[PDB]
Amino acid sequence: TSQVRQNYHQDSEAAINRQINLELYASYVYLSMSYYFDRDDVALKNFAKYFLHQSHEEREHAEKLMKLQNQRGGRIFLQDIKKPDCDDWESGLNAMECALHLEKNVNQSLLELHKLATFKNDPHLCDFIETHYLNEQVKAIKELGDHVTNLRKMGAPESGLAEYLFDKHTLG
Amino acid sequence: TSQVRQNYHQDSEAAINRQINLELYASYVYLSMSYYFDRDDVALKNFAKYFLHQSHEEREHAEKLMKLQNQRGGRIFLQDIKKPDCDDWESGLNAMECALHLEKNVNQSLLELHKLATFKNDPHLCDFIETHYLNEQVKAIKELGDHVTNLRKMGAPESGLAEYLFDKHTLG
Amino acid sequence: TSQVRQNYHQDSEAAINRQINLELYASYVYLSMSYYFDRDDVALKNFAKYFLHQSHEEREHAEKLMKLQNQRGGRIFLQDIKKPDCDDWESGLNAMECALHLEKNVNQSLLELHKLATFKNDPHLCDFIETHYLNEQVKAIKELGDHVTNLRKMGAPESGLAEYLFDKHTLG
Amino acid sequence: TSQVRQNYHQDSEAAINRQINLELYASYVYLSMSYYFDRDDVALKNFAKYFLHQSHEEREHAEKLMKLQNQRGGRIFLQDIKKPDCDDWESGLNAMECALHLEKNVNQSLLELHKLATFKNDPHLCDFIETHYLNEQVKAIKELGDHVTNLRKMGAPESGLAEYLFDKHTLG
Amino acid sequence: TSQVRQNYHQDSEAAINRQINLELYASYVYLSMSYYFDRDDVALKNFAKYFLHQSHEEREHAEKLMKLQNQRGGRIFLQDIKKPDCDDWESGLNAMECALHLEKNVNQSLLELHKLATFKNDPHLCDFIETHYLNEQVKAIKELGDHVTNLRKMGAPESGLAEYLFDKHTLG
Amino acid sequence: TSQVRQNYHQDSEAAINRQINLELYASYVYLSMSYYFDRDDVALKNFAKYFLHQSHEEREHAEKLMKLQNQRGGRIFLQDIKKPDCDDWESGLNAMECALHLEKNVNQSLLELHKLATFKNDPHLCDFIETHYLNEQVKAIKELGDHVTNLRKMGAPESGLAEYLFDKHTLG
Ligand SMILES: [Fe+3]
Ligand SMILES: [Fe+3]
Ligand SMILES: [Fe+3]
């Protein structure tokens, strides 16, 4: 065991050791979503960094995790960072959606990982959780909810001017 | 009667609260509209702050009044702030229309009001409006109809692209 | 079903907008008070500015929730705000004795919702209550509730000097 | 009757008079440890300020737990402030093993405090603990339980040198 | 024995260390006074600032003695610290009667401790009081008198419309 | 194909894809290294930084590879980023002998790589890695074998004194 461990349960840190690779993938796809746009025939640069931002801000997410488990007597078990689902993510709107697809997910589990300490009696995990991560996605799911809305009304993916004026007046 | 009372009439006294409560309704629909534009299936953001500046203006109108009754001896008689019947606002263009519409009709109720002060021979209360109001809503319907003019001559409402570009360049 | 909605139960969404109107119930009636002492036959300075203040600090309190609807998938729904029944607040004492009632009503309403917030296991909302609301309406009852012991310790509402003194000096 | 109390069960106030004490039994327990290293026979001063800084946070602890007490109508019944059972804190290693051990037995008293505030429906304190008292001692449990290792890994008490090189590197 | 002990008896070490559970005992009384006017049925919070001010300068004299006790190679022997004798300080004047009463239970203590210094012939322990303690503990008796007198002459306690003028103009 | 491919083979473009992986296999190692050391049963603080910071720095080693592909109109195929070979880096002594074998492997992943641009006559490749990538990692091999020899003189591992001070002095 450890010396700082207290009110910490092995079925809880096991989910923490599960959230860790769950944040690492998002970064890895976000990151795949970045350079997808660096490409010549692709060529929307301001998309990318939006996905490079939230891949970078993604990295501090995965750290704050690692911090608690140490804060709390949990060791750290690392397995593999799987490869993305697609490498060709097609449509300038496909990405925002596929992004939204994965933001819902973290937010789900994060609301599943919340309830676990709701009944193993760990209200400390109900502060660093109820404060540092929820509204993170709630506004991220909120933002990518206005984003996808706009391309569509712009006429995306059938409009090509949609992903230019976006990549300028929303992402500039 | 009070102490500051002079020249003043029960009628115009009575009409201001009619013309006070409605600045709140105005701001309440400006507010109602403002956040309908936050919807995920909207993503019209400078449209939101537009009508949110307007509510905090049409709120100021309600304040830019209530002391005047206490500056002359009349007491305040408010009634129920009723909502609008168009909970959902269809299009920015359409919202401008209703916005315009009410403004146009809040306007006349200020014309109405002036015309009564003119009757009971109250030159001050005519110039409180002179100094503070009719010289303002005139300004409003001008660029209001200007907003139609663009979007209605751009291609909107059936142009979910013109809404995008009307905003990033007119609303801010 | 909005595309930004994940566990936002029907009762909760139908209750966020219940409070909002209640939230806008206060903002209105506070402002009734903010103009009783603007009455000439009343004439107390900073008893209108403390309420003018809240009347906008309740204004803001509502807006933090109309986002939340749109932020959790919820469609805002709007209702009639009713006029205050008290045409007169007698004296500045009973006023705060009516804002204590208010600030107290606002609480069990938060609670009974933060019950249902836990009911449908929406903790996002739960921590949201606790911050801008649970945490503030406590001291907003310690604040307002201190402004009452002294007033009657001074000698209000009988002796009318206490009102002069508390208006200048505590509010200075 | 207490004119501010509201959803504040009486079983919660009794365990706070009992807990404020507990955070004052540790300001004084710090106030011993802060001079045993002052003393010229040990003379570890960067040790001294540590437990003299700690002697101000845990005084700041028991002091916010009392502003709140009047902010919910809870009444403060003080009790005796007993000394500890140990006095010449053998080393610095051991002079921290107690500093930690004595605090773990505050989080536990807080975890059961969050627990008791849960069984009797009080989210204002549960959030109050959530924010002002949860992570802090996780920091402290971190702030101490690690030191212990480095202390141990250099060679204390086998080396009174360590307590010095640790003194003026870790604590300046 | 102490390598640094020189001309320092042991009733000295016993009476210093006897006169530290009297300077501190004052800190604990002022703080209860502080969180008495923190109360909602009292609600005067400059009284409280005051006694939080005596809560801490009379918390710094122990810091003098403890070093002093190690200045002089003596050891520290702590005991319990009682709660003060009242939990409800009755009134605002009467929290000042007693305040002027205890600093006289500590003056003559430190005065009739000033003699044993002369016994063991230890003028260090003499001059150490003739400035750093006794010059400023006969000031704090002087001021409370003016406070108590002002109190009994401003009309305490019969005139409740009074002891709030003192809370504002003198204490603030 | 590519509207910009030039002199840019298949076999060329190959390794880029699989070296991206490697600099991802590495930042993931420094990732865990940094937090093995953040464990209280290790607690060597600024050990964390050194390895954290070189995870943030060998991170950009990949992005700038994943940017070259694009530039020359290459194609990305991000494979899985696997788990670290050891999960308990024993001590600072081992947890650094690893970096050494590691970065030499990464280096020889490029010595034997760069010469592809040589057979395939990729001059833009024969200098980029020279300028942006090679020496930056020779300026990290040295940066470790200067700790590695330090710790063999400071008695590591058998001298657990050696680990504490390298923190504040070399890496503080
Ligand atoms: Fe997150
Ligand atoms: Fe309020
Ligand atoms: Fe409030």
Residue numbers in the entry:
A (entry chain D), B (entry chain K), C (entry chain P), D (entry chain X), E (entry chain C), F (entry chain V): 5 to 176
From the paper:
In order to achieve the proof‐of‐concept objectives, we chose a 24‐mer human H‐chain ferritin (HuHF) nanocage as starting materials; subsequently its original Asp residues nearby the C3 symmetry axes were mutated into Phe, and the resulting mutant is referred to as 3FF. One ferritin molecule consists of six C2 rotation axes, four C3 rotation axes, and three C4 rotation axes. Here, by a combination of the multiple, symmetric interaction sites on the outer surface of protein nanocages and the tunable features of phenylalanine‐phenylalanine interactions, a protein engineering approach is reported to construct a variety of superstructures with shape anisotropy, including 3D cubic, 2D hexagonal layered, and 1D rod‐like crystalline protein nanocage arrays by using one single protein building block.
To confirm this view, a self‐assembly behavior of 3FF (2.0 µm) was investigated under the same condition as above except that the pH value of the solution increased to 9.5 (20 mm CAPS). As expected, 3FF molecules assemble into 1D rod‐like crystalline protein arrays in solution, which was not observed in the solution of wide‐type HuHF and other mutants under the same experimental conditions. Thus, anisotropic π−π interactions have an outstanding performance in the assembly of 3FF molecules upon changing solution pH from 7.5 to 9.5. The arrangement of the 1D crystalline protein arrays mediated by C3 vertex interactions roughly resembles the bct lattice, but the unequal offset distances of parallel C3 axis make the structure markedly different from the above 3D crystalline protein arrays where all contacts at vertices are identical. The results revealed that the A‐type interactions are strongest among six types of Phe‐Phe aromatic interaction, followed by C‐, F‐, D‐, E‐, B‐type analogs. Joint‐A is mediated by two pairs of Phe‐Phe interactions, one (F123Ab‐F123Bb) of which possesses a T‐shape conformation, and the other (F123Ac–F123Bc) is offset stacked. Structure analyses revealed that the 3FF monomers jointed by the A‐type interactions penetrate along the c‐axis in a right‐handed‐helix manner with four monomers per helical turn. A bundle of such protein nanocage helixes join together along the ab‐plane through relatively weak π−π interactions, resulting in the production of the 1D rod‐like crystals. Collectively, all these results demonstrate that with Phe‐decorated 3FF molecules as building blocks, pH is able to serve as a switch to control conversion of isotropic intermolecular π−π interactions to anisotropic interactions, finally realizing shape tunability to its 1D analogs.
